[PDB]
Amino acid sequence: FNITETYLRFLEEDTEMTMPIAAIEALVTLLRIKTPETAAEMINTIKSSTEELIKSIPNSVSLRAGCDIFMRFVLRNLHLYGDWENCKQHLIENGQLFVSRAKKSRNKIAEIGVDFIADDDIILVHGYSRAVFSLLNHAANKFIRFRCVVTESRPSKQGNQLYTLLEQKGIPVTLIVDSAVGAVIDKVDKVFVGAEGVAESGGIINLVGTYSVGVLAHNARKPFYVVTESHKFVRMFPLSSDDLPMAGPPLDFTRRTDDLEDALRGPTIDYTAQEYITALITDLGVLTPSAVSEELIKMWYD
Amino acid sequence: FNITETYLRFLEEDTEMTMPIAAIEALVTLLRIKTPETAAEMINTIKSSTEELIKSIPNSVSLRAGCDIFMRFVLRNLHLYGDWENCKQHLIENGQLFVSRAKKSRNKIAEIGVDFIADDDIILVHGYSRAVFSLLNHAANKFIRFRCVVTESRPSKQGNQLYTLLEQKGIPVTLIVDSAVGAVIDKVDKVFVGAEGVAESGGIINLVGTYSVGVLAHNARKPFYVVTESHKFVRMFPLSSDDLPMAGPPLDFTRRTDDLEDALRGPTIDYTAQEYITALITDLGVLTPSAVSEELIKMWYD
Amino acid sequence: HPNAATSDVNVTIDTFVAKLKRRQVQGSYAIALETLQLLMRFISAARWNHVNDLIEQIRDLGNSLEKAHPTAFSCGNVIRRILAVLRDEVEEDTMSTTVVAEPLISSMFNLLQKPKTDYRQVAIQGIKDLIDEIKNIDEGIQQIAIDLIHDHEILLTPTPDSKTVLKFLITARERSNRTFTVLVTEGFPNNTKNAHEFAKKLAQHNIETLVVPDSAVFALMSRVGKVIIGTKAVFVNGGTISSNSGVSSVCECAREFRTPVFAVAGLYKLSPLYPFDVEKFVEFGGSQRILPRMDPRKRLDTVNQITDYVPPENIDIYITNVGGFNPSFIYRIAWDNYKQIDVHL
């Protein structure tokens, strides 16, 4: 029936259906066909489909995290030894209810996380997450004064994409390069970030230059922010500064070339430690330091 | 006779004969025609031509520094109250001898500054200078082992230019982005930086992301280098982290745009403080901190 | 909901409102006691018979109380504390009226799995327990705190205003085995009088007293063993609002010299609210106490603030009646006493 193909169908869609929430909705559809009455036939085939999904993954982390929460909810269903049928109907229904919860959470955060941006504050924003930009838009809806500084992130050129999406709103902007990002931290009140994942330790899984931002801000004593939707938690503990799950290059040094083809190769995803984050924002209240681990301990019961 | 036009003629030339040394050679040619005997008729017209040169400058500092040294040498000529003809002949001759001194200094440095690169050390190089690359080439001539990491500098895509010039030698390389430059400082032994100017205080005048490199290296405790030819000293004291002589923008924030035209604007030249430099290398011996200021005090006699 | 229903039956609402606005009431400890006696009067006098209508009414009363006075966090916390004590006993009561409820631990995750009696008596006793808790905090502090400070160590102290901290210091000086030198920053525009009384009570007990001007803090930081804070209110992220003047700079001075920072507080003093901005939370002082003469005060726009904020980056321990906790853990102590809904009243 396929799950990778269902995820590939979301091309011109996105924005509303968040990348993990669309993968979770795809997991529920695959579950509801071949009877969730059996726990040997279904769960094993769900595990095989997640393994097939991980094997097809090039540079995504959040899809593995979202699977875990689904699994957890499924197991928790019939924890009351309830009827093998009303528990099943509640499990199938919690697929569309899971996607509907992404809207309700965004409604919560955009009213909570506008408080952090005070009267007339210049912001240097890095990365693009649907939660952080929704704060930025619904603060403009709240009629609050804020300036914006764009970071030239280099994955699939994200800075230019961010700049254009800020133009459509009506907020004054200018391009700042990630090389010169050190020379900006004096005319900037606060530094904001959108994460691809949040660590078990309390650190962050992010883009092509975020640790560098974290350290410079720690030097300048200027605050460093992480805002996300509460589903990007993996049981992952990157022990060192340069160790992450990869399908491509972990720093490759190429031979002598004349035509110039083999060059680009650098760490596209980088980790930053727990100390560098001043504040973290999700729908699960306002919490930063040891909070992430407590969430993971509560979920995994281990 | 023009001086700006003489400097514009160096297009396909450059290299070995440096940009400031070509401006100093242009200063001597302008001097030697209209009689250097008169100190009233000539020095005022030399000052007007330097003022016209500064007004034509878009993004260069070293041309203003090179004029000063010339002036100084001219004044020092007739310090012995010598014949107003033999002192003049020695002044005109010290123009071609000045450019010949750029050869002798490069011969000195490339044998002195190869000692810093030890047995098998991974180098991360940023900000291309003729002195630092001459160290890199004449160490390969010395048959020593060294690995090289390319930084993606963004003034006019300099990183790609640096990468191609390293390919023409026979040394293994790979592209590292200035955003991710924080994620490299553990596998890199030493960080080398070539300067556009060295401060009165002991700091550095450099490109689109060098302070950021300096701070990160200070955090990682990994050494930070400055290698140059001894003519890039101005009596300049940037008081703050973001204050420099400019003909363009000092951080501009533009209005709401749809066609996307006004964006790029960021600090193209950035300063770093004296503390971040571990070591400095010139032809004037091996010296780093207050040495620069001593030189400047020795010149200016003030 | 307005105070139109509670006027003849309850009069003491408006007298507390009057005590806050004109600042007739002083010190978080006292504000808490009054709100306790308010809720004591609310349950003893009112007639409700229904439970959910009652709780939401209490929520609106607390909402109006915090809007009446923003620096009365001890007011806001005490109500929130009883609210949660109520909510647990209601959830226990609903399980018996309907008829695993014990998975592993006492977690959170309210986003995952879905869902006449002596309840009023429990509400009564719940207030009584809160009073007794506020009555005795020092006993719970001294058993954790007087284990960390050594002989021949010099203690620098901003905020001498706290009754809690001074009494912690006197119990340690009672131990003849422990010797320490006390440096006290003055805190000129506000704390001065309190700092002088602090220095008097230390001499009364014969402890090596040293009065320090707010300029001289740097000139001593090389010699300082430890730093202690007399905080008013503690927060989610860890940070504190303290009882006025000259703390933030001292903490900045300590961190640069890598000198340890201590904080003495209570759980009622601890708040489940988040300080997103210091700009809103901090109260500003009266510039009258700085400079005389009003014709020069046209041109002399003087700045003075009472309450001082410390970011969590500096302090390391919050010794309470329960125990010593790190700022990266204090949120859990908070959630153990106040619920997630009981924040936005």
Author numbering:
A (entry chain B), B (entry chain A): 4 to 305
C (entry chain C): 10 to 108, 113 to 128, 147 to 376
Original authors' sentences:
For multiple rounds of initiation to occur, the GDP on eIF2 has to be exchanged for GTP. This reaction is catalysed by a guanine nucleotide exchange factor (GEF) eIF2B. Here we have determined a cryoEM structure of eIF2B in complex with the GDP-bound form of eIF2 phosphorylated at Ser51 on the α subunit, which sheds light on the molecular interactions between the two molecules and provides a basis for understanding the regulation of translation by eIF2α phosphorylation. The structure consists of two eIF2 molecules bound to opposite sides of the eIF2B hetero-decamer.
To improve resolution in this region, we combined particles from both datasets and carried out 3D EM data classification applying a twofold C2 symmetry and using masks around eIF2 molecules in the complex. This classification resulted in map 2 with slightly lower overall resolution 4.3 Å, however, the local resolution for eIF2γ and eIF2α-D3 was better compared to map 1. In a low-resolution filtered map 2 contoured at lower threshold, we could see weak densities around eIF2γ, which cannot be attributed to this subunit (blue and red masks). Each eIF2 molecule has two spatially separated interactions with the eIF2B hetero-decamer—one through eIF2α-D1 inserted in the pocket between eIF2B α and δ subunits and another contact of eIF2γ with the catalytic eIF2B subunits. Another contact is formed by eIF2γ and eIF2β interacting with the catalytic eIF2B subunits γ and ε. Although eIF2α-D1 containing the phosphorylated Ser51 is relatively constrained through its interaction with eIF2B, the domains eIF2 γ and β in the proximity of the catalytic portion of eIF2B have relatively high conformational heterogeneity presumably arising from high mobility and do not adopt the same conformation in two eIF2 molecules bound on either side of eIF2B.
